[PDB]
Structure 1
């Protein structure tokens, strides 16, 4: 997979969590620790190889007015560890939706976590409207969100965005979301 096409994927396949993280990253060229962990694990899941992930993170962070050597000094170990290269050397699996929901709670200045759970209903409505979702679809997603079934809300998002009446799968992993989107498109 190519780094350049990653942005393209962010248009369609990326679940809303990864879309938010990528938007923040390209807006500010820097992510707090939680965002770094989540996005790195997701990009590992999609298939970005250690060299590819290292190149992507290097290029993205270098624009943030930091020394090039600082990246290799600090973030290289984290990137390697996400791929089970150092330390205990374990092939850490990508975060599951349950973990993301029950993982570290985001705070001010953070963008990780599940937007359906960590975004206020007004903010979620605004975001859904921004993505040109039909008003009926936005209302249905909001109703699902009020029901505490955020996974069902993401399933509704997938159904509406991919022009499919039924998702046909129980979304329980962001990598599952990306895989289903790739299967439908390609």
Structure 2
């Protein structure tokens, strides 16, 4: 307590309840923000790489906390000025990051996760004395049953909880809940009831503490997102907070490539029309969406592809999310009856809605006039003999055989070796042959 200190920072760990009221410098603001961003990113990386109970996790996290000079260990000496400084850092940095990490739900979740992890670690480093001190300073009042009451009902608790050993029971702490909330436990008589309260078991205490913390933190983030307009007007802090998350401290593109070789002629025609006009009638939308689902395009990937393709068609960006998002979701069984709709089978495509003027769906071999099919086959550099054979097969009403002949000619294979009965089968065979 040198010059301008106080009792504002009693303990190392805190729930970050009271916002700071000081006037800090812009340099201090930026330094604290970046430092805590580094700390949280380190926490995330170590959580991904290691098990949070592992000793490697603890060692690396201690090293990072020491490197960035954040409070991580207690000190049974007093509130030394340096210690005070560190705690102040922690307290301000946290709230700064709150301002950075409240704009989007994703961000919020990320922040919460990292914070919880850090808090857990710090709790894990608290000596029992310190632990109690903390539990008192925040009015948590865990002696959660007291130790004295636990000894008072020791035998009852021992006989209440199934498979609880004497010493192991001594190592556990219970909670008092109104019996109306423990219905599923009381009903089969697996928890002791005393005076209208059940004594429910949880090492475990950290869990309860964390639960409380998480509740509080979520609430706080909501409030911060509600108080965002006041901060956006401060240009000084806009470049930082708006972009802190992005601060240095199958692919859609290949789809076109696939359309060159693997796509069956139906999908090739649909893709050509889509890239020519950036818009497809309903039948084409359904067929192409189901096919792209079949090849593996994930819901996010398909949404991105359709958004990008349609936006060029001189339509509002919001209109896409308003209208076509539901259809795209439904094709993947996300809404409505929520069924994983399978890709169209060749029989369905042939016997599905008959295409009309302005449409491009359906099987070209069936829905294209022989002259048009001949022209298309010639365009693809197919040998004259192959084109004649394909036309002859088409005249025989065996369009599936025509597609098999197309596959044989285009892939330079004497025999297809498979009974083509699904466009996804066509694409899979092409991928197997090429890759």
Normalising by structure 2, we get a TM-score of 0.43
In the alignment, the residues of structure 1 paired with residue 342 and residue 377 of structure 2 have an alpha-carbon distance, to the nearest angstrom, of 29
Deviations 1:46-90 (A, max 9, x none): 000000000000000000000000000000000000000000000
Deviations 1:25-51 (A, max 9, x none): 000000000000000000000000000
**Aligned twin of 1:29:** 278
**By how many angstroms is 1:131 displaced?**
0.0
Following TM superposition, where does structure 1 have runs of at least 4 consecutive aligned residues deviating by more than 2 angstroms?
none
Deviations 1:90-147 (A, max 9, x none): 0000000000000000000000000000000000000000000000000000000000
> Which of the numbers 60, 65, 77 marks the counterpart of 2:309?
60
**By how many angstroms is 1:17 displaced?**
0.0
Any stretches of 5+ residues in structure 1 without a counterpart? none
In the alignment, the residues of structure 1 paired with residue 415 and residue 266 of structure 2 have an alpha-carbon distance, to the nearest angstrom, of 21
In the alignment, the residues of structure 2 paired with residue 21 and residue 119 of structure 1 have an alpha-carbon distance, to the nearest angstrom, of 13
In the alignment, the residues of structure 2 paired with residue 162 and residue 58 of structure 1 have an alpha-carbon distance, to the nearest angstrom, of 32
In the alignment, the residues of structure 2 paired with residue 99 and residue 170 of structure 1 have an alpha-carbon distance, to the nearest angstrom, of 16
In the alignment, the residues of structure 2 paired with residue 81 and residue 136 of structure 1 have an alpha-carbon distance, to the nearest angstrom, of 44
> Which of the numbers 382, 387, 396 marks the counterpart of 1:138?
387
**By how many angstroms is 1:173 displaced?**
0.0
In the alignment, the residues of structure 2 paired with residue 124 and residue 51 of structure 1 have an alpha-carbon distance, to the nearest angstrom, of 35
**By how many angstroms is 1:10 displaced?**
0.0
Any stretches of 5+ residues in structure 2 without a counterpart? 1-249
In the alignment, the residues of structure 2 paired with residue 47 and residue 54 of structure 1 have an alpha-carbon distance, to the nearest angstrom, of 13
**By how many angstroms is 1:155 displaced?**
0.0
In the alignment, the residues of structure 2 paired with residue 171 and residue 179 of structure 1 have an alpha-carbon distance, to the nearest angstrom, of 11
**Aligned twin of 1:179:** 428
* Partner secondary structure for residue 328 of structure 2: helix
In the alignment, the residues of structure 2 paired with residue 124 and residue 163 of structure 1 have an alpha-carbon distance, to the nearest angstrom, of 20
Deviations 1:125-174 (A, max 9, x none): 00000000000000000000000000000000000000000000000000
* Partner secondary structure for residue 139 of structure 1: helix
